[PDB]
């Protein structure tokens, strides 16, 4: 009906001012599947010369009200609604309230419940609160972490009018925020937080991604006739070697901090594949693609050339690669 609905509201408000507690730290803000009402209310002092920020060295102005279920949430709506907050009225009654209060319920004495509300207390732990070990003096202590709601509200308001880096997290829904049971999370469900990243020249891109990869030639030395065991006998195949190196190495110049080192295990491996235990006379190992124009240190980028043939390649490139 109408003028008959107001009965249900003030019926429900007085039936649920016993399940609404006072808190600064709530447990369901980490995971909303944690059973019960676990949390803490920190009412201690401020040092202000200590080197660290906590919930007791910042100026937080509004406490928080917490319930277990979204059903028992009408006191939080009640304390937040006048013509000229309801909280400030019930601290110092101005009748402005008392006049309007007593003419619909005849029970404002009971409701004025919202004043000496009990504090939230930590009594147990579950699998949904983060528990870690910390070394204390030869043994360990088990620590269960409860996040701060009052500090999250305070940071998000003070970052809204500032120009330091910030990130907005958009991950909670309306129905998920209600299930937490806290007033300050149902109003701020998408908070603003600090951005704490390393300097901006140390971020990954594709230029840093391709400077850690190395090129290989496209010629199996074991199928190009003119090469025996691993050494070039012909003299005509030389132009093909000089060209391959040029093609694959044209502009990929690299500085020293970016070139694969010349290991000793690799020049041994090559030796084995074809027999020799030591490098035969007049022959010198050579990379088909140079190791300063970007190349690999592998068995698939190595050829043994005669001592004069190595002199031709080591200078013809030098002109083309300046």
């Amino acid at each position: 009906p109408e003028e008959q609905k107001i009965n249900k509201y003030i019926e429900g408000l007085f039936q649920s001012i016993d399940k609404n507690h006072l808190a600064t730290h709530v447990a369901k803000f980490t995971e909303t599947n944690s059973p019960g009402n676990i949390g803490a209310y920190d009412i201690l002092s401020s040092d202000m010369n200590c080197g660290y920020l906590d919930t007791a060295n910042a100026g937080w102005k509004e406490p928080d009200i917490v319930t277990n279920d979204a059903k028992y949430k009408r006191p939080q709506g009640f304390v937040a609604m006048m013509s000229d907050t309801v909280m400030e009225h019930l601290q110092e009654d101005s009748a402005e309230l008392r006049h309007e209060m007593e003419e619909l319920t005849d029970k404002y004495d009971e409701i004025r419940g919202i004043l000496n509300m009990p504090s939230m207390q930590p009594y147990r732990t579950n699998q949904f609160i983060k528990q870690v070990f910390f070394p204390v003096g030869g043994s360990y202590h088990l620590l269960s972490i409860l996040p701060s709601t009052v500090l999250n509200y305070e940071v998000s308001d003070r970052l809204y009018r500032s120009k330091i880096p910030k990130i907005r997290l958009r991950l909670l829904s309306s129905n998920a925020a209600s299930t937490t049971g806290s007033r300050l999370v149902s109003k701020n469900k998408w908070p603003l937080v600090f951005q704490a990243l390393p300097p901006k020249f140390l971020e990954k891109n594709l230029a840093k991604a391709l400077d850690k990869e190395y090129l290989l030639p496209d010629i199996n030395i074991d199928e190009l006739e003119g090469v025996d065991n691993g050494c070039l006998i012909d003299e005509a195949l030389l132009p093909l070697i000089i060209d391959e190196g040029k093609r694959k190495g044209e502009g990929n110049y690299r500085p020293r901090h970016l070139r694969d080192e010349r290991k000793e295990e690799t020049v041994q491996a090559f030796l084995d594949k074809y027999g020799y235990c030591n490098i035969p006379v007049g022959y010198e190992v050579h990379h088909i693609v140079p190791l300063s124009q970007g190349g690999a240190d592998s068995i698939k980028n190595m050829i043994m050339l005669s001592i004069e043939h190595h002199e031709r390649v080591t200078e013809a490139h030098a002109s083309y690669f300046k």
């Binding site: 599947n33 949904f128 958009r170 990954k204 991604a209």
Partner: protein, 325 residues
């Protein structure tokens, strides 16, 4: 002597997969040559073609619908796609990170050791190497492919290659020599005889010249810009680790009613697959009931149920008693 599951029990993963990166190559020069693949932006003009109530349909049937998107395609000179990822295999009895009660630790260690005695993790490992050989980690990239080859490297030994189009995606093979040789090493790592194994997988998919590649799509919530956002790993396209792992755990063929639906499903607690919207293992053959019949009321279960329970322990998760206040 044991009345319930402990108050904090947690298992970690034993098959840890890293992210994947895409490259473009050519098939006749695929052992020597690779180029980067990049994600481009694309905007479209569309029509309003979704189901609407009859009042709105008479007012918005012929309105324009601009939207934002992103895409990835191969070049006009390359015809293949190269994907590289890696797996790390760790033992099962050392993947328990928390257990409040000591007697439950003793009982579960005994049960894993009896499962090492009979079928020492060899069936499941063969199924995992089958899902590496079938190339099921190519979700929409396996459709329309001329040649698919997969190469598996363990340590410094490169094994002979696979022809992934010669395998069916519903039947598990137990006769290939290469699959058995890899599966023995993965089984011995699972059993505790070895302490770690590192696997490196390379796949080559021949699609066509300028055809479309399908990367992994991100979950981002921004109110201003709603569009398709694709995964960039170090500037290049790739796939998430979760998709590759979900491809690898599709080994379950022991659910209650398999003779009608004859396909393998992923290994979950209540048999929940994101394709069919009815759970396949709803009550009697769930994980919790079988694990509270294997440890708490000592019983010998059939070997298929033991296979399912050990598969859940290789997948990992938070497995504890219902939480009271």
């Amino acid at each position: 002597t044991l009345k319930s599951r402990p108050e904090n029990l947690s298992f970690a993963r034993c098959l840890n997969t890293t992210e994947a990166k895409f490259w473009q190559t050519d098939f006749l020069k695929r052992h020597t040559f690779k180029l980067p693949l990049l994600i481009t932006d694309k905007a479209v003009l569309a029509s309003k073609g979704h189901e609407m109530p009859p009042d709105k349909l008479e007012k918005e049937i012929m309105d324009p619908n601009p939207q934002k998107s992103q895409s990835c395609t191969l070049s006009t000179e390359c015809d293949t796609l190269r994907i590289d990822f890696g797996i790390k295999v760790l033992p099962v009895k050392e993947s328990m990170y928390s257990c409040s009660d000591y007697n439950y630790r003793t009982a579960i260690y005994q049960k894993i050791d009896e499962y090492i005695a009979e079928d020492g993790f060899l069936t499941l490992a063969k199924r995992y190497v089958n899902n590496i050989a079938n190339a099921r980690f190519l979700w929409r990239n396996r459709k329309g492919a001329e040649i698919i080859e997969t190469i598996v490297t363990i340590e410094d030994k490169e094994y002979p290659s696979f022809n992934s189009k010669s395998f069916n995606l519903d039947t598990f093979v137990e006769d290939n020599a290469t699959i058995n040789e890899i599966a023995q090493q993965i089984a011995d790592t699972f059993a505790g005889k070895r302490e770690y194994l590192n696997i490196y997988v390379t796949c080559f998919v021949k699609i066509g010249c300028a055809m479309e590649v399908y990367p992994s799509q991100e979950m981002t919530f921004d109110d201003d810009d709603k569009g398709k956002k694709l995964f960039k790993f170090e500037g290049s396209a790739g796939m998430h680790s979760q998709k590759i792992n979900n491809a690898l755990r599709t080994i379950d063929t022991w659910y209650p009613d398999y003779t009608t639906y004859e396909f393998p499903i992923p290994v979950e607690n209540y048999g929940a697959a994101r394709s069919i919207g009815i759970p396949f293992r709803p009550d009697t053959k769930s994980f919790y009931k079988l694990i509270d019949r294997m440890i708490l009321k000592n019983e010998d279960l059939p070997i298929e149920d033991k296979h399912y329970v050990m598969a859940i322990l290789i997948r990992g998760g938070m497995f504890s008693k219902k939480q009271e206040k």
